[PDB]
Design an enzyme around this catalytic site. Structure first.
Site, PDB file in Angstrom:
ATOM      1  N   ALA C 149       0.833  -1.023   0.019  1.00 46.78           N
ATOM      2  CA  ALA C 149      -0.113   0.186  -0.087  1.00 46.78           C
ATOM      3  C   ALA C 149       0.878   1.262   0.111  1.00 46.78           C
ATOM      4  O   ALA C 149       2.256   1.291   0.448  1.00 46.78           O
ATOM      5  CB  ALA C 149      -0.763  -0.028   1.196  1.00 46.78           C
ATOM      6  N   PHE C 151       1.454   5.699   0.762  1.00 49.35           N
ATOM      7  CA  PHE C 151       1.481   6.414   2.093  1.00 49.35           C
ATOM      8  C   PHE C 151       0.096   6.760   2.220  1.00 49.35           C
ATOM      9  O   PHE C 151      -0.035   7.497   3.411  1.00 49.35           O
ATOM     10  CB  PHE C 151       2.507   7.469   2.094  1.00 49.35           C
ATOM     11  CG  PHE C 151       2.310   8.233   0.857  1.00 49.35           C
ATOM     12  CD1 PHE C 151       1.558   9.536   1.053  1.00 49.35           C
ATOM     13  CD2 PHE C 151       3.190   8.225  -0.364  1.00 49.35           C
ATOM     14  CE1 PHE C 151       1.643  10.394   0.191  1.00 49.35           C
ATOM     15  CE2 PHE C 151       2.822   8.960  -1.281  1.00 49.35           C
ATOM     16  CZ  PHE C 151       2.181  10.204  -1.090  1.00 49.35           C
ATOM     17  N   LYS C 175       2.120  -5.673   3.382  1.00 50.22           N
ATOM     18  CA  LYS C 175       3.366  -4.529   3.567  1.00 50.22           C
ATOM     19  C   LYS C 175       2.877  -3.173   3.519  1.00 50.22           C
ATOM     20  O   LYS C 175       2.698  -2.829   2.728  1.00 50.22           O
ATOM     21  CB  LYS C 175       4.364  -4.849   2.418  1.00 50.22           C
ATOM     22  CG  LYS C 175       5.629  -4.089   2.589  1.00 50.22           C
ATOM     23  CD  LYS C 175       5.893  -2.536   1.958  1.00 50.22           C
ATOM     24  CE  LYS C 175       6.979  -2.159   2.101  1.00 50.22           C
ATOM     25  NZ  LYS C 175       7.034  -0.863   1.590  1.00 50.22           N
ATOM     26  N   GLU C 178       5.587   2.628   4.612  1.00 53.01           N
ATOM     27  CA  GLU C 178       6.712   3.078   5.735  1.00 53.01           C
ATOM     28  C   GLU C 178       6.602   4.174   6.515  1.00 53.01           C
ATOM     29  O   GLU C 178       7.143   4.319   7.594  1.00 53.01           O
ATOM     30  CB  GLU C 178       8.136   3.359   4.733  1.00 53.01           C
ATOM     31  CG  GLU C 178       9.552   3.283   5.758  1.00 53.01           C
ATOM     32  CD  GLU C 178       9.673   1.838   6.177  1.00 53.01           C
ATOM     33  OE1 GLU C 178       8.892   0.891   5.822  1.00 53.01           O
ATOM     34  OE2 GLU C 178      10.865   1.913   7.013  1.00 53.01           O
ATOM     35  N   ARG C 179       5.387   5.206   6.123  1.00 55.31           N
ATOM     36  CA  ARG C 179       5.451   6.068   6.802  1.00 55.31           C
ATOM     37  C   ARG C 179       4.076   6.051   7.865  1.00 55.31           C
ATOM     38  O   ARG C 179       3.883   6.689   8.869  1.00 55.31           O
ATOM     39  CB  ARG C 179       4.976   7.346   5.780  1.00 55.31           C
ATOM     40  CG  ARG C 179       4.948   8.692   6.480  1.00 55.31           C
ATOM     41  CD  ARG C 179       6.262   9.215   7.162  1.00 55.31           C
ATOM     42  NE  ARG C 179       5.921  10.724   7.585  1.00 55.31           N
ATOM     43  CZ  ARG C 179       6.834  11.334   8.233  1.00 55.31           C
ATOM     44  NH1 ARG C 179       8.156  10.778   8.142  1.00 55.31           N
ATOM     45  NH2 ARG C 179       6.729  12.556   8.386  1.00 55.31           N
ATOM     46  N   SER C 228       2.363   5.602  -6.856  1.00 57.05           N
ATOM     47  CA  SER C 228       2.935   6.294  -8.125  1.00 57.05           C
ATOM     48  C   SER C 228       2.785   5.402  -9.309  1.00 57.05           C
ATOM     49  O   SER C 228       2.558   4.205  -9.169  1.00 57.05           O
ATOM     50  CB  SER C 228       4.165   6.759  -7.696  1.00 57.05           C
ATOM     51  OG  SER C 228       4.994   5.745  -7.448  1.00 57.05           O
ATOM     52  N   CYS C 283      -3.703   9.553  -4.277  1.00 59.49           N
ATOM     53  CA  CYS C 283      -3.329   9.095  -5.844  1.00 59.49           C
ATOM     54  C   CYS C 283      -4.472   9.665  -6.789  1.00 59.49           C
ATOM     55  O   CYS C 283      -3.913  10.389  -7.798  1.00 59.49           O
ATOM     56  CB  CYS C 283      -3.198   7.528  -5.954  1.00 59.49           C
ATOM     57  SG  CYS C 283      -4.644   6.527  -5.462  1.00 59.49           S
ATOM     58  N   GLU C 383       3.878  14.347 -11.891  1.00 59.11           N
ATOM     59  CA  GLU C 383       2.886  14.274 -10.975  1.00 59.11           C
ATOM     60  C   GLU C 383       3.162  14.939  -9.705  1.00 59.11           C
ATOM     61  O   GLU C 383       4.226  14.775  -9.285  1.00 59.11           O
ATOM     62  CB  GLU C 383       2.577  12.893 -10.486  1.00 59.11           C
ATOM     63  CG  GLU C 383       1.885  11.695 -11.404  1.00 59.11           C
ATOM     64  CD  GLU C 383       0.613  12.034 -11.495  1.00 59.11           C
ATOM     65  OE1 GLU C 383       0.070  12.402 -10.690  1.00 59.11           O
ATOM     66  OE2 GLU C 383      -0.235  11.715 -12.667  1.00 59.11           O
TER      67      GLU C 383
END
Lengths: 439, 485, 470, 463
Positions: C149, C151, C175, C178-179, C228, C283, C383
């Site tokens: 996934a 952020f 998974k 990270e944020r 992204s 997104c 983007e």
């Protein structure tokens, strides 16, 4: 002091029945009076019908989504009060705790299945379900959710001899926030059935009990303009082939036949030891003896007592008649003596041999802890014997051959066939329930 | 010597039966004997049932794809010989060329829809429900089936009954109306030429004994019927009591409600047409209407539109309405009209006086308009089965709804109105399944099944469509656990 | 304090991570460390995969009804723990309370939808196709699945992704970002509380190394990703290389078109709410707009409406857009705005110099509107992923449609107009599957993922032909 | 004197090709040239693509019912001219008349299935689910079922609303040309379908041209992977059922006679030139003792030309395939493979000049040997030996690819265990060919592939 009296849920409130008659209900493990069930009088039944009629418009205007959410809340309440229903079933019927857990879990599954009608969805009006006088079958959890979600009011006629199990369901329903007066519960005897069938406002009737009473109710409703989907739990025949697991097959036969005193509808009382399977009778009798005959609340209760002492008398008379006809009783449960529960209606596992279609036991629905075995020379003979019986709901075959299972499933007229499984589809509702309770 | 006689269909081959009793088929336009049909005896019926049984296993083991291909070939043959069947019907039953064409066209559409039944015939399965446990669901045919068609629809009713049973893997024994078997024999010839294996379809003829046999015989599992209420109830009481499901779309009496907020013109024309279309010889016809508000004042326009319809032979132009199938039917319609007149119903237009030129010997009856009718008149109690319009003027729509509900034969009712609230209120309080709005008679499309309702419709499952497959197919579930130790 | 670490979830225990490499989670409103997320090592990932494989058979052989019950209880717990998840999201990701509430609400709705895949999971069979011959198909799980996934949407995306693999009978290795791993850990705890068999779900944290492992390991059968375009394409290519089936939404670019024959006020409000909604970090953000006809003269009203947006921390009231995900994100957004300005694009509205009282340390960036944008400019090609709106000037609908088509990774857009012929022309000419009409965001629900298509993805068919003749 | 040429199909007309490269169609029964297929030039393919593009809009604007009726007329024409297709197949590919008729019937059934599809092609929150077509499609045919390849792609590709550019087997173009003539006669608009012949160069062109939105291919794994990669490189839809070896397990309890008969019929049927051919088998337990009787049954096969009666199997498509299978058998023997039957040097009386190859059986083969790796695509059946069902299951799973797998047995437990633990898309029980054609990755999948989806949503109550 006196045993407690059940209060029928009529008009959205539990009211004491004013009837004079009060059928005494006795605990089947000790024949101790636990409660009285009243016969609904004409006035009480008319009041229940009026309550159902007044609740019908509100419940109908209620969107299908609201009904589904109400049924979800009811399912959640059942999940919370599951152990309460289990204890009620174990007390009323003396049924083994594990069997009560299984029954309540099956009822919960049926409720959740009924909840899945979200997109499939007009109501008919007032509906009623007739329960068998044999055992506290969980018909309420089977039919009431369908009629509810479909938008119809339900007038459940449960087994008068076991009211608490159903009354607790109505209590939990009222706790679910459903409109007061949607469900009504009435008890009694053939008088109440006659009333229900005669009244014109009732559009649908349900029955899963005996064949005779089922046909009677079906005919009465058809004459009085009611769509009846009676699915009486007639006899069940199981063909046992030699090329099958001996131990597992024997255990399954013993459990399905004597489980819960063999009072369940799909009890596999009848078996066919075709193809040299006769040699398995000693092991079958040994496994039957190994069953712990004890009250359903105490540990080691593989089979419980009979619903009423009249049921025990009937079973004893049937066994005596079978013995008179020359049927060897390899195992006699009439003389069972349960320690600490002698006063109960306990009937030990009974096994009858050399039974044939001419025997009365074959032409009579035992509905008890009795098993009858037959013998044939070929699979075709067993198929013909199974087909000859018009009173059949489900059948099972134990074999390791694919062609044998295919031939049995096809050439057999029974609607439900089991392969290496004693009781397939133990529920006898379903998809047809929508069309049944709608138009 | 011997008027053309229709033969049976035994073992996939036509043969002359032992005719100990003939039935004279008369041309409705001339009442002249145009054909005779024999009384099938126990021997021919037993042979037909034996052929059906012997053909059942092969046709059942046959893939559904080949059955659908056979149905497609039969539909193609029908489309090729459409005009043949149209002319046969116009000659034997008496309806117009256009009516027979529309009938055969609707039958062909139903056959086409039935041809595409792959997905519907597919079962279900739930594998790995439990360790080494599996659950299957197979749909299978019931076995031998039978169909009793009326004289009103020599093509639609069979083209709805027999092809569904055929494609579903069941064997079908057709029993067409002894008064119009020619179209059924033509359809059977076409089906045979399609490529269907012999022994699947069988046909027997009879008046009352054939029905008794079809009902009493145990091997027959399903029976379908369409026609009068008496015969339908009789067949139902026989079949259901003998242990066989039955579906009967009995004689209907559609009530056409008119609302003051309509154009009045297309609706007056549609009412006049449906009430008199094909001489009202239909199992469902709009021979009854209810006028509310200005609809009552609209009576002169209704009478005028009725007068416009000309009576002529079905094979000639201007035949807006045809003659009665039999002279007994003409006499019965005349007696019903006379009873209505006697009972106080003002007939603004008497059709009994109309006579067609060059065909006076035929059973022609002009458009009859009966106004001021009430539940006390016999025309309301008894279905006319003729070109008669029963009009019950009601001061309020509530009385109209009450009358439509009292009608024990309210199979299908419609209301002409451009306002949605009025149609909604009508559908709400009316106790009829097929409720149509701005339509003379709401008829079911080939995509869904009949949606019947009152004494005029009964059965365990509807004729064709999804419920049709449900009727002609069982549902057997297998719970197999092929585990080891 | 010790900055409590984000412990892993392997098997039926939240085992602590022994990894040496750690990443410090910073609050976007104050840039203050609030937690440490580990970088799972090879041994931990191997143990997680082994747990997933050991749990797979029991979860698959289990009745689908039990899985549906588990999902129902999980949805119920979510309904109970809504506020906790919302607060954790507002804290970590920095979005507003309303944003996290709507996120969890959409997640719960998708969970409910997936709960009704019972009928879909049923197979088909045809009895007696040939003499003593039958045919039937069995729908079975693929095996072990994995999820990556972004952020954004730390709760909605997992709730859309993993429950389908669960009901289908597969085991899922999620998974998280990270944020923002806290929300995922809370969701996993709630799921475990739902009575799910231990080992069915496993969670590992780590940088690109974790993605490489997940894509390279053979036991993994299916992988899902959202974010992204570069990362999505990389993951898809790596999966195709190693044979992993990958479904990824990489066309995050979205364009808005406004014709003069449309509701000015409502269209402007919807555009301002979608583009700058949640700092334009999602997104599927409508960060690009094409103004046609009188839309150019309305652009001033768009800027006026954007000025009304109150840049404030999510925890405080009146928060229309929260701080950016990371300070590096703010730096990148500022650099892109400066590049667009240098390229000649007039900055009708600037938010780089925004200062939220009491939260200046955060990564707050106010609404930014860029006009005079052309296809050759970087602001159009790159983007942004921020509260910046690029406005291109066109004269006719054909020009806007061509501009939209020039962006192949642009599977999302909407048109504002009153004529049905114009809407049909836009829907036809535009080569986009998700086409909206008078709607800011065209059904945020993205796809190549869920529904019956999700079942088809997370399941396979086995045609069984058996003829037990004799 | 000069054999006839194979015509193209552009703009609804069989135009002649101007290319200089021509391949001689050698009759596999006698190696006699019976045709000349050209290689489509750049200009010819460009004209075909232009015609497909010009036909796309008109063909798409039509309703699903028009295309359904067109396909029904095409199916009727095929059914009328089935014997012509069978004769063309038996002449070009050398396949037996019975097998050719069965193949044409299977193709007709596929066409009918494509016709049985419903309106599904069409599909304040006003929403729509319009499933528009893709555009210009193409397809490449292998040498296994050339006459049937177009019957798989044309029906769906057309009824979905897309134009197709077929690339038939240059060595078997007659069947596809006859099918296209029948389609045109059915009344389809001119330019809807186009056909071009060529070689790997043509496949490269097709995969490279942008107008080609989708491509379908079946055959060898090498060409399959190559086309898949080259298509995914250009960002266009691709789907291909890669050919693979099928493993037929045989338990000792199974019907020995019936099992051996079905194995000999499937493996050696049509010289094994089928993508579903059961080229491999696994004798479990006592089944090993059935090798002599298996060889006897194989010998019992009657080798003869496809046009002669009693022909159980036909010759190979080209002599190159014969040399290839001979080299493969030689390599297997060298590696230590114990051969039991050798039909390489077979001399069919009256057709010695043909590519006929008698039944061949090989035992003692191991997974590491080339016999188990390289696809034979010939009348060769490699037999493996195992001790338990688990060994056979593991051996079958180790195969890098597989379309179908069969297990002959009467025990339901063993059959269910094999079907559940196996990782093959199609599993057969007591049937060497689970499905006449590869369904595993079309029907539903084909509809989903050849079409797209646009979820037009609108809230337009205010204006």
């Amino acid at each position: 002091s006196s045993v407690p009296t059940v209060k029928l849920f009529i008009g959205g409130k539990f009211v004491e029945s004013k009837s004079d008659k009060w059928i005494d209900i006795h605990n089947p493990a000790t024949n101790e009076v636990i409660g009285r069930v009243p016969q609904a009088t004409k006035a009480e039944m008319d009041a229940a019908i009026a309550s159902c009629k007044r609740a019908f418009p509100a419940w109908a205007d209620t969107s299908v989504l609201s009904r589904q959410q109400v049924l979800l809340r009811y399912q959640q309440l059942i999940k919370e009060n599951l152990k309460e229903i289990a204890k009620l079933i174990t007390l009323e019927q003396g049924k083994t705790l594990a069997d009560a857990e299984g029954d309540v879990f099956r009822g919960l599954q049926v409720v959740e299945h009924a909840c899945s009608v979200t997109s499939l969805m007009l109501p008919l009006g007032v509906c009623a379900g007739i329960a068998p006088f044999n055992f506290p079958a969980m018909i309420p959890l089977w039919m009431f959710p369908m009629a509810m979600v479909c938008g119809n009011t339900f007038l459940m006629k449960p087994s008068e001899r076991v009211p608490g199990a159903t009354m607790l369901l109505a209590k939990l329903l009222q706790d679910s926030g459903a409109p007061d007066g949607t469900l009504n519960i009435i008890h009694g005897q053939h008088e109440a059935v006659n009333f229900i069938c005669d009244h014109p406002d009732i559009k649908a009737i349900s029955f899963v009990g005996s064949n005779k009473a089922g046909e009677y109710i079906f005919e009465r409703g058809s004459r009085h303009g009611k769509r009846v989907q009676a699915n009486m739990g007639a006899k069940n025949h199981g063909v046992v082939m030699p090329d099958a697991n001996k131990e597992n097959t024997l255990n399954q036969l013993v459990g399905a036949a004597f489980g819960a005193a063999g009072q369940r509808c799909m009890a596999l009382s009848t078996a066919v030891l075709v193809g040299e399977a006769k040699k398995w009778l000693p092991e079958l009798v040994e496994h039957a003896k190994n069953l712990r005959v004890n009250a359903g609340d105490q540990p080691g209760a593989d089979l419980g007592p009979l619903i009423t002492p009249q049921a025990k008398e009937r079973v004893c008379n049937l066994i005596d008649s079978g013995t008179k006809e020359g049927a060897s009783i390899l195992l006699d449960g009439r003389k069972i003596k349960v320690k600490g529960y002698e006063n109960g209606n306990f009937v030990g596992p009974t096994i009858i041999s050399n039974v044939k279609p001419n025997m009365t036991c074959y032409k009579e629905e035992i509905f008890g802890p009795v098993l009858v075995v037959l013998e044939t020379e070929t699979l075709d003979e067993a198929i013909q014997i199974v087909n000859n019986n018009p009173y059949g709901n489900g059948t099972a075959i134990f074999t390791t051959n694919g062609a044998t299972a295919r031939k049995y499933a096809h050439l057999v007229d029974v609607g439900q066939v089991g392969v290496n499984v004693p009781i397939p589809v133990p529920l006898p509702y379903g998809k047809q329930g929508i069309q049944f309770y709608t138009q």
